[PDB]
Each structure stands twice: as C-alpha cells, then as structure tokens.
C-alpha cells in the first residue's frame, strides 16, 4: 500500500466529485454542493487528499481533509478543520493523521495562530487523533449535533 | 466536523 | 395526478408572468466559458451564507422527496375513523407523548406536535371548527384536545420570547411560519371547551379502558393550560400541578392493559413535504412509552414556586445554588424561574427592588449597613448571576466566562472609590465563581487526565485565598461582637450617672440593631469555611493522587504523545486564558505550576521511595475521613436548621437537594481513598513484574458521587 | 449578456420532473450549479416557499426569465 498526499486540484472536477462522494457517506450532517464550494473554491490550498498509488485506481481519493482560515476577532488568524474522512477499507493506517499534519503544517506556513474544530463527544477516534497532536478541549456545546450528542470545541495553539 |  | 384541481392548476403556474424567455442555452455556454475555480455572485454576498442551502433531488436535503404511505397521503381530518372511542384515545395519547418528546426529549416542533394532521388543520383555519366529521368525539372531544395543546404551544412561545434560554438547543420552536395572531382563544375558552368535552365523557353510559384513559387525557391537558397561571398571576398553588402528577400516575398503569393504534397517517411527515419548509427533512424520533415526563415537568415547576417563600437573601442565594445543580431541570421550569424570580413590575419576587435585593446580599454577608451607577450595575450583575443558574449543564459554565471579567472590572471600580464593603462582596462573588467555573470543567469532561493536576491545584490555590478572605471577614465580625460585649462589661463597672446612660443607650441600640446580624453572619461564615475547606481538601487529595501517579511514571502534567506543532507553555496558557486578566488572586506563572509539582512528585527510589509514598497515601486516607467528618457536620446543621445557633446554611427551600449534594460529595470522598489503595497495590506489584502491564489514567465519574471531583482511575491499555 | 447581470433577478427554473422553482439567483459556478434565494416551489395546484435552495446541473430542465425584467438588465 503506497499512499500519496496531494493538494487539491481545483480544475480536476472528477477529483472534486470524489471528495464530496467520500465525505457524504461518512457525515451525519448533510452538505449541499455550495457547502463544498464555500471551502474549496475560496480556500483551494487548504484541502488535501490521500491517494493509493499502487491501488487499482491510483488517483481516486481514499481520504481527504478540508480546511479554512479566517482572522478570529481582530488580531489572530484561526485555521479551521471542517471536514476529514478516510475510506472504510483504509482506516487504521495513519492516513488521517498525516492528512491533519500536512494541513496544520500548511496553515502554519500561512501564519495561522491556532487551529480550531468541533467534534462529537462520542467520536473517540477523532478525539484521540486531535488531542494526541496537542489539541485540548475549550468548550462543550449542548446538543450541538442534535440527537448525535454534545460536541467539544478543540483548539491547538500555534503562536 | 462542520455543522450549520 | 388524477386530481382535477392539479390538472387545471398546471396552467396557472405561469399565468403570473406575462412573457417568458428560455435562457438554458445561454446559461450552459456562459458557464462553460467560466474558469472551473470561479463562482459568479454578488461581490457583497458572503459564500458562507450559502452553507444552509437545500439541494434538490438530494434525499437528505430535499423535503419534496419524502416517501409517504397511501394512508399518510389519504388522511382526511373530516373522516371519523372507526372505532371512534378507541381511535380518539389513540390519537390523543399520541399527541401528549408528542408533547413530551418535544419538550422533555429536545425534539423538533415539526416532528412532534405539528406532525399531527389535526394540529395543522386547527392552526390553519385560525390564521384566516376546522373539521366536521359528524361524530361527537372528533368534532368536540378531540377538537377540545387539539385546542388545548395548541394553546399550550402558544404559551411556550411567549416563554421563549423572554430570551431566557437558548433556542434550538434548550427548546426547539420551529413552527413553520405559523402565526395565529390574536385569533387563538383565551384561557377561559380553552378550559371551558375541555370541560364541556369532559362532561360528555362523564355522561357516557358505556365504560371502557379507552374511555377511562381519555377521561384522564382531557384532565391532563386542562392542567397544562393552567401552567400559564404561574406567570400571569404568579400563583404558588400546586393544585393543578398535583392533578397533573396524579392523572399521569393513573395512566401509566393503564398502558400495560390496553394497546393503542391510531389511524394510519394521523401523525406523519406530511407537513414537511407540502407546507413551506426551509429545513431538511427529518424522521420522527421514537416516542416515549409512558407519561413519566409529565410527572418530572410538574415536580420541577413545583420546585420553582418554592423560591417565593424565601425570607432572606441567603435563601434565594442557596436556592439558585441548588435547584438546578443535581440534575438539569425541565426546560419549561428553567425558563419559568428567571421570569418568576425577575417579575414584570421590575421587582424581585414582588418584594424587593433591584437595588434593595442587592443591598440584602451585602448586608447578610458583611453584617454591615451604610442608588448610584456602581450599585445599579452591581444589582444587574447579581441578577444575571441568578439567571445563569437555570441554564443547561453546558451553558452554565459558559456563563461564567462573561461574569469573571465583569466582576473583576466591577471590583477594580469599587477599589478606585475605596468602597471596601462592596469591594469585598464583589471579590467573594468573583472568587467563588472562579472556583465554580474551574471545577465545572471536570463535570463536562473538559480537562484531560494530564491536565488534572493543573486544574486541581489551581482550585486548591484559589480555595486557599478564599478561606483566607473568609477567615478575615469572620475575624472582623468577631471583633464587632466583642465591641458590643465590652460595652456590657463596662456598664457593670459604671456607677449610675449621665455617662452610664450614654453607654446604656448605645449598648441597647447596637444590641437591637447590630447584634443579631453579626451573630447570624458569624454562623453563616462557619458554613462557608467548612465547605471551602472540604472543597480545598478534596483538591489537595486529587493533587496528591496525581503526584503518586507521576511518581510511578503513569502520567505527566503534559501531553505524553509527541507532536511537532505546539509546546506545553502555549497549551497551558490557553487552558488558563479566562483567568489571565484577573489581578487578584493573580494567576500563577507557568514555572510555579512546574515547581509545585516537583514538590509533590517522588523522585526517590527503593526504600526511600516507599517512605515518602506512605506519607502521601496516609494523608489521603486521613484527609478523606476528615472530609467525611466535615460533610457529616454540615448535614446535621442542614437537618437541624439555622436557629440552632452554630451554623447558618439558608438551605430551607432546598434542604433535600442540599443533603443529596453532600451525600454525593461524601461518596466521592470515600471513593478517593479506596482508589488510592488500589493504585498503590497495583503499581507496587507491577514494578515487581518486569513484563508488567501498560496503564492509562482516565477521569471516571462515580455514579452516586459528585462529578466535580472525578476519580483518577488507571486502566489496562489494550490495543483495538 | 454577462452572468453577473442575471444575479439578483428572479429566474423560473423548471426541475427535471414536473417541479418549478421561482427565486432570485444568488450564485452560479462553472459547472452550472445554481443557488437561489426566496425560492417558491410550484408543482400542480400546490405552492410553498423553500428559502435558500441549491440546484445541481443535472436536476435542471430549463431556465426562463421574465421578458420585462430581462430588458432592464441591459
Ligand atoms: C477519524 C478517522 C478519519 C480515522 O481514520 P484513520 O485513517 O484510521 O486515522 P489514523 O489511523 O491516522 O489514527 C491516528 C490516531 O487517531 C486515534 N484513532 C484512530 N482510530 C481510532 C479508533 N477506531 N478508535 C480510537 N482511536 C482511534 C488513535 O489515537 C490513532 O493513534 P494510534 O494508532 O497510535 O492509536 C475515521 O475514524 C473516520 O472516518 N471518522 C468519521 C469522520 C469524522 O468524524 N472526522 C472527525 C470530525 S472533524
Ligand atoms: Cl477520481
Ligand atoms: Cl398514526
Ligand atoms: Cl450572600
Ligand atoms: Cl445571614
Ligand atoms: Cl459606592
Ligand atoms: Cl464547590
């Protein structure tokens, strides 16, 4: 298994469609097509995909992470991780971890002071991933995901 | 994840 | 399809527009001309505003693609489905359990109350009964039932219009554009309609299980219409609240005997597919199986009305500190409390003004008596503190973020004017809220196990400053009591004369106007010192437990997993960001946290390690018993009352809840000592095993313990 | 006739299977995906409002604009 991590090619639309195809299977909150075009078209450099070079389909995205950055309050830039998903047959191989690393490293190159994200309290897989990278819980939102459960606001300070 |  | 009006209506869809030009060929070639990355839009428009968009032909986001059964489409409000008595009861039963799922289970309004085709029918005619079935049960009996629940939701709307709690997380009110204006009848009409339909059931000669349940259902709906009385008239009467409990208890035993099946399509997702809807389709959540939610709702509202019986500022203070602490109250009661406490005539409980109510808290805490902007701003600050107590378990801690920086600003403004009596009370409220805000994070699983030492020692650090402030306040009050006592000593030595009359005149004046409050505050400060030392000792036990865990090498005060992005100092400052602008007590430096930990951590080895470890465990087991003794003393004074003369707790309104709080606090105390024995016995034996186990520390909530102090339990690490 | 002229104007977008959407155009991309606001969904006799709706390219059958509105755009 040979995994290659690529920055999003905005002109590649079949790659764009496979990103939505993958994210939509593993999300609880459904996203319209303009949810994706809000992230990818405005922040193309902050979306990465993972492909398997030795697989039968080399360029198909088996995993991807989608991020954005905006100035928080007035004096700080806050990077945001909105979407992260890995194919079900590829989990447990460190793929998502390296996708988060290459995303936070990119946002750190773009002079982000912090990375923020929300996730369910019941998502033990995602919590161990982020908190193991230095994230800490700053907030608990009551029924943020409705009947899915409460949420944790995670922040990783960079500067 | 992202939730509106 | 085969409907006549849909056929002719297809011609009228374009009638409003006089001329139409096809632009599809133009759009395709122009969009084909654009670069793939570009999006044509109004430059003013923010693309984030398009994230709440729906998508057509997307099953998860298109309301038009909802699949319905034939019965759900064909349901007619005017058809009286057989059997009438059994179906009306089954329909009415579903509606009340829909009310519970909406309010108790935090479900959306379109899924529960508005899913009923009869509810949508009654509200639709009011905007301009609604159905005439030809049967007395559907037309009048059910027509009264639908009106009662519709009147209930209108009152729920007015509770949400007060802005007390947060919409769509504490309570959903998505009515799909339903505005009944003033067309909805008043309370008198709704109750009489339910009473007239009730007397029809009484006059019925037949007797059945379905009739008996319907008898109670109309009675329950009558009680829900009477919930408005606690707001409009502020009545403390538990009459209708006792009926609602008793009728629900009678119904819960009837559910096993009968089985109810409503007409197919009576309750469906039909309203989402045809009425104006700007939200994605949503399935109908599973409904409750009993009427226990009505009992919980009625008990919580009964508790809210207890605060009207308060006579002192301490009784209102302790009520807010206990009514919503043990478990989150019903959202109806959590909204009703700030509206019942802070009333329409700008008075607190109808007895005190905003400034009077604040001056009570300072008088009863400082035992001293003296309308500017500082007092006015502090009075508004105190009321927002009361209103935060009724928030949910998450918003409760979030409310302190605003309070801590505002209390500190308020205290600094008092110090600039050198008004030290008010400055001290503001400092007490601030430092109390700092401790509360910090210990609440353990209840919400905010802190990870490696951050346990940082937070537990910080609260201990804060608790040491609060005990110091409280003990000096009691010393200042003690000297005032002795000053009055010394006058009595001096009067006995004095011969009868004019100067003895001056001292006798001032002794009685101080004895009649100052002595009683100084005694009551002295006993109240005894309770505060006992509670803060209990809270202080528990934090120290948690710090000693963490140090033992680090001494064995199981946990560190930082993240053990390496990462190439951040550092410990940045993460530590982020954790303590809210306490950064507070000058007194000053937030300890990052180095003070580190150096203090090394004082507790045992770096010795062998026999020297075993000696220092025994002193640490011996403190845990000893201090736990000393905490149990202090908790036991408090529980006796709460049972005995405040007029005993030793302690003053002001827990008369929340006696049972306060006793339950300390009993849970006593369980955690005993649990902390038991766990320290397990940790020592496990890790000592584990050192002997060269191929020992690999452990990880987890913050565990004791079920019947107090969750502000979780047990640092170690568990075997197994791979997935 | 640039696409920027059409935004903010009411478009009559007929969906692929007997559905009519009437709403103001907010955004359009290179793949011809439409974002409409104040959408009114008309099918047969019934009618309802849907707020902000997104229409993919495949779902569209035809797009039409009122002729008086079109001439004031120029
Ligand atoms: C989160 C997710 C992408 C992980 O995929 P993955 O390729 O297996 O990620 P990784 O293999 O790199 O895991 C790295 C770390 O995360 C943690 N982790 C990963 N999978 C875990 C699991 N099933 N259970 C507990 N922890 C897990 C572990 O700490 C792991 O480190 P370790 O292997 O040393 O124990 C996958 O679970 C998923 O698709 N979740 C749904 C999408 C989502 O909710 N994302 C987060 C919302 S922002
Ligand atoms: Cl592809
Ligand atoms: Cl039904
Ligand atoms: Cl007080
Ligand atoms: Cl008092
Ligand atoms: Cl003053
Ligand atoms: Cl406490």
Numbering used by the authors:
A (entry chain A): 1 to 159
B (entry chain D): 1 to 4
C (entry chain B): 0 to 127, 133 to 374, 382 to 731
D (entry chain C): 4 to 77
Paper text:
The transfer of an acetyl group from acetyl-coenzyme A to the free α-amino group on the N-terminus of substrate proteins is catalyzed by N-terminal acetyltransferases (NATs), and is considered to be irreversible, as no Nt-deacetylase has been identified so far. NatC acetylates protein N-termini starting with methionine, followed by a hydrophobic or amphipathic amino acid, with amino acids at positions 3 and 4 also contributing to NatC recognition. NatC forms a heterotrimeric complex, containing the catalytic subunit Naa30, the small auxiliary subunit Naa38 and the large auxiliary subunit Naa35. The large auxiliary subunit Naa35 acts as the central assembly hub of the NatC complex, forming extensive interactions with Naa30 and Naa38.
To obtain insights into the substrate recognition mode and the marked difference of NatC catalytic efficiencies toward the two peptides, crystal structures of NatC in complex with CoA, and either yArl3 or Gag peptide were determined to a maximal resolution of 2.99 and 2.75 Å, respectively. The electron density of the peptide ligands was sufficient to model the first four and six amino acids of the yArl3 and Gag peptide, respectively. The yArl3 and the Gag peptide formed several side chain and backbone interactions, mostly with Naa30, but also with Naa35. In both structures, the methionine sulfur atom at peptide position 1 is within hydrogen bond distance to Ser28. The Phe2 and Leu2 side chains of the yArl3 and Gag peptide, respectively, were positioned in a hydrophobic pocket (the “main peptide pocket”), which is formed by conserved residues from α2 and β4 of Naa30, as well as the short 310-helix η3 from Naa35. In the yArl3-bound structure, in contrast, Naa30-Glu29 forms an alternative hydrogen bond with yArl3-His3 and does not contact the peptide backbone. The yArl3-Leu4 side chain is at the periphery of this pocket. The α1–α2 loop of Naa30 moved ~2.8 or 3.5 Å upon binding of the yArl3 or Gag peptide, respectively. In contrast, the Leu27 side chain appears to be flexible in the yArl3 structure. For the yArl3 peptide, this interaction is sterically prevented by a hydrogen bond of yArl3-His3 with Naa30-Glu29, which may partially account for the reduced specificity constant of yArl3 compared to Gag.
